[PDB]
Design an enzyme around this catalytic site. Sequence first.
Site, short mmCIF file in Angstrom:
data_model
loop_
_atom_site.label_atom_id
_atom_site.label_comp_id
_atom_site.label_asym_id
_atom_site.label_seq_id
_atom_site.Cartn_x
_atom_site.Cartn_y
_atom_site.Cartn_z
N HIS A 1 0.95 -1.13 -0.04
CA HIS A 1 0.14 0.11 0.08
C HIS A 1 0.68 1.07 -0.02
O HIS A 1 0.22 2.29 0.04
CB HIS A 1 -1.14 0.01 1.18
CG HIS A 1 -0.69 -0.15 2.49
ND1 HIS A 1 -0.52 -1.68 2.72
CD2 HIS A 1 0.02 0.65 3.44
CE1 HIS A 1 -0.25 -1.58 4.13
NE2 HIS A 1 0.07 -0.43 4.40
N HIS B 1 6.63 6.99 5.50
CA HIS B 1 6.29 6.66 4.32
C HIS B 1 5.44 7.72 3.93
O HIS B 1 5.29 8.69 4.43
CB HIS B 1 5.08 5.39 4.47
CG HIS B 1 4.00 5.52 5.43
ND1 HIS B 1 4.09 5.66 6.77
CD2 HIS B 1 2.72 6.30 5.12
CE1 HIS B 1 3.00 5.82 7.18
NE2 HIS B 1 2.30 6.24 6.15
N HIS C 1 2.04 9.26 0.87
CA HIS C 1 0.81 9.00 0.21
C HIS C 1 0.93 9.80 -0.88
O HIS C 1 1.62 11.10 -0.61
CB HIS C 1 -0.34 9.48 1.19
CG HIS C 1 -0.47 8.48 2.32
ND1 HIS C 1 -1.07 7.51 2.43
CD2 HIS C 1 0.06 8.86 3.43
CE1 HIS C 1 -0.93 6.81 3.55
NE2 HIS C 1 -0.15 7.77 4.22
N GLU D 1 -3.32 13.71 2.28
CA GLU D 1 -4.31 13.05 3.12
C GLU D 1 -5.18 14.22 3.83
O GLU D 1 -6.20 14.51 3.43
CB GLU D 1 -3.88 12.03 4.16
CG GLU D 1 -3.40 10.67 3.17
CD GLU D 1 -3.47 9.54 4.18
OE1 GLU D 1 -2.90 9.38 5.28
OE2 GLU D 1 -4.05 8.77 3.72
N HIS E 1 4.65 10.90 6.06
CA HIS E 1 4.08 10.38 7.57
C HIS E 1 5.38 9.63 8.23
O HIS E 1 5.95 8.77 7.80
CB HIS E 1 3.11 9.60 7.88
CG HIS E 1 1.72 10.17 7.31
ND1 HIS E 1 0.77 9.40 6.68
CD2 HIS E 1 1.54 11.35 6.96
CE1 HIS E 1 -0.29 10.09 6.45
NE2 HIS E 1 0.22 11.36 6.58
N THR F 1 -4.19 6.19 9.14
CA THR F 1 -5.16 6.52 8.08
C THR F 1 -5.17 5.42 7.41
O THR F 1 -5.90 5.38 6.19
CB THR F 1 -4.63 7.72 7.45
OG1 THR F 1 -3.52 7.41 6.78
CG2 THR F 1 -4.62 9.10 8.21
S H2S Z 1 -0.85 6.52 7.64
ZN ZN Z 2 0.38 7.41 6.30
#
Ligand code: H2S
Ligand code: ZN
EC number: 4.2.1.1
Length: 259
Positions: free
Chosen positions: A63, A93, A95, A105, A118, A197
């Site tokens: 992911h 990591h 997004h 996010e 993050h 999240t």
């Molecule tokens: S996350």
């Molecule tokens: Zn994250």
Amino acid sequence: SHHWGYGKHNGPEHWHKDFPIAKGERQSPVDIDTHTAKYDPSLKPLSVSYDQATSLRILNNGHAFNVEFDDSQDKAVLKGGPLDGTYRLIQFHFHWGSLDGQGSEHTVDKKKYAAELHLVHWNTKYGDFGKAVQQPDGLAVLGIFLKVGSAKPGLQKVVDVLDSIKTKGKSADFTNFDPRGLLPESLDYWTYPGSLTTPPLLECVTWIVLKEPISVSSEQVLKFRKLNFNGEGEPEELMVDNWRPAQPLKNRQIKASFK
Ligand SMILES: [S]
Ligand SMILES: [Zn+2]
């Protein structure tokens, strides 16, 4: 569903079926309404001590990609800000989106950034990560937005290794990476109580979102978009848009460290 992901059929709007806490009272991310965020002069400056950070490995978990750190001792910690106690860095990591206009996010006054970093930390009073997630103050996540502009030199070592962890379950040794090259100049922030999240969506996070974005080049973000959600030898699904949309603020106040 079947396993959760970001597709049409197992995407964020479906998570609640397997993880009912998805419709909880302290879910993340949220939109940061800058005019309603309350300046709080009782908040102390954050304290980031990453000079002894020990990176170990980078992994594509299906992911996102995580860079993991040795957290067996107080080497890379965060303290101060709205926190009580010491929080140890375990992993970071990102997004990101399929286009530059989306990817983050958290949003700011409804503005979406190209990506969101993050840095994940866990409260040392709990002894281990698995125990920290079960507590209301168990984690502290520093969120940093990315906008497309000039290249970020401290991010290139990351970009360059992506080819080796293209598909889910792949990993690579990744020692001596210094997370200090990913911080903006200012540590001014907003803070609020929220959750992870991604599933399991546990409400155990004190979010610390930095006001100043870092800029990355278009070429740098392009390489993120080359990763795959799928495992080796399965049909190719590019890892893009692995972000959860903003959730209701409900009974929460966003505090600002600045005015
Ligand atoms: S996350
Ligand atoms: Zn994250």
